[PDB]
Amino acid sequence: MAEQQQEQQIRVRIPRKEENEILGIIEQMLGASRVRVRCLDGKTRLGRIPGRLKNRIWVREGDVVIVKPWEVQGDQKCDIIWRYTKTQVEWLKRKGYLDELL
Template sequence: MRKSKNNANKGTGEPQAVTRVRVPRKDKNEVLATVVTLMGGSRVKLHCMDGNSRMGRIPGSKKKRMWVREGDIVIAEPWNVQDSKADIVWKYTRPQVDWLDRKGYLQR
């Protein structure tokens, strides 16, 4: 006998849960970025949506919680003293990236 998977919303006509997606805040100088290369030592190479390439850093408070891979979409906060470097403050999941793409936040 086969075990059936629990598909709560499939075929029942119930609306799916509304999820909130964090967008970059202009007042905090945040930009969307794509991870290009993993450099090691919690450093990554980022291609930001404002046209710049930056060296990204995963802060210590997020290092164990946020696993970043090449191709991930993240929110980066450029440094005030050095514009070529940035801190990664948020990583998007695949459904969130699809939502950002549909709403026009991503320029691919």
């Protein structure tokens, strides 16, 4: 219900989802091309970013990210996307509260 120049889109509803994805928040101040994420949808993984995002994320401490699952074992690897409050992570987070209560 909005089509004008300079508009913030939700960017939600992402395609490609054979086994669904997990949602976690990233943390890391050192900055060694890798970060640590904790996620809902039952997952705990180390998140990695591409060279372009690596020099464009500059995460300080307390950011939200979407993660991909890597193998299983007693710890999973994940491919993460960094963003500070937008709509995609807000959607999955709202779903977490819905499942818990409400």
